[PDB]
Amino acid sequence: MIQRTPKIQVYSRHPAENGKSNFLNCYVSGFHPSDIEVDLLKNGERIEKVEHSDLSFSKDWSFYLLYYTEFTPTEKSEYACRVNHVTLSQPKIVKWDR
């Protein structure tokens, strides 16, 4: 058996075809087992309609998840990614560094 703690990155990207669009991304990488819970948060509340959840693996024991959706950030709100995994004794909340 092997278990590996996810690395968690939270960032925004504008698709080059539409600069008015902005995506909030949680990139959860290098984890095992594949069991996981990932949410995007706005002001600590789970964002319910996340448009994209892309799972892959490299080696049989390394998984990668890109979890992302359209958003319109303001100065008045806080955005984050929350991850639960067996390797994490408490939920890990990673704030967006703008």
From Swiss-Prot:
Residues 6-94 form the Ig-like C1-type domain. GO terms for cellular component: cytosol; early endosome lumen; early endosome membrane; endoplasmic reticulum; endoplasmic reticulum lumen; ER to Golgi transport vesicle membrane; external side of plasma membrane; extracellular exosome. The keyword Glycoprotein applies. Keywords: Amyloid, Amyloidosis, Disease variant, Disulfide bond, Glycation, Glycoprotein, Immunity, Immunoglobulin domain, MHC I, Pyrrolidone carboxylic acid, Secreted, Signal. Glycans are attached at residues 2, 20, 42, 49, 59, 92, 95. GO terms for biological process: amyloid fibril formation; antigen processing and presentation of endogenous peptide antigen via MHC class I; antigen processing and presentation of exogenous peptide antigen via MHC class II; antigen processing and presentation of exogenous protein antigen via MHC class Ib, TAP-dependent; cellular response to iron ion; cellular response to iron(III) ion; cellular response to nicotine; intracellular iron ion homeostasis. The modification Pyrrolidone carboxylic acid is found at residue 3. Its main location: secreted. It is found in: Secreted; Cell surface. Disulfide bonds join 26-81. GO terms for molecular function: identical protein binding; MHC class II protein complex binding; peptide antigen binding; protein homodimerization activity; structural molecule activity. Glycation of Ile-2 is observed in long-term hemodialysis patients. Belongs to the beta-2-microglobulin family. Heterodimer of an alpha chain and a beta chain. Beta-2-microglobulin is the beta-chain of major histocompatibility complex class I molecules. Polymers of beta 2-microglobulin can be found in tissues from patients on long-term hemodialysis. B2M alone (not in complex with HLA-I) interacts with M.tuberculosis EsxA (ESAT-6) and an EsxA-EsxB (CFP-10) complex; the tripartite complex can be detected in the host endoplasmic reticulum. The B2M-EsxA complex can be detected in patients with pleural tuberculosis and is stable from pH 4.0 to 8.0 and in the presence of 2M NaCl. It is linked to Immunodeficiency 43: A disorder characterized by marked reduction in serum concentrations of immunoglobulins and albumin, and hypoproteinemia due to hypercatabolism. Patients may suffer from recurrent respiratory tract infections and severe skin disease. Amyloidosis, hereditary systemic 6: A form of hereditary systemic amyloidosis, a disorder characterized by amyloid deposition in multiple tissues resulting in a wide clinical spectrum. AMYLD6 is mainly characterized by gastrointestinal and cardiac symptoms. Neurologic involvement, sicca syndrome, and carpal tunnel syndrome may also be present. Inheritance is autosomal dominant. Component of the class I major histocompatibility complex (MHC). Involved in the presentation of peptide antigens to the immune system. Exogenously applied M.tuberculosis EsxA or EsxA-EsxB (or EsxA expressed in host) binds B2M and decreases its export to the cell surface (total protein levels do not change), probably leading to defects in class I antigen presentation. This is Beta-2-microglobulin. It comes from Homo sapiens. The gene is B2M.
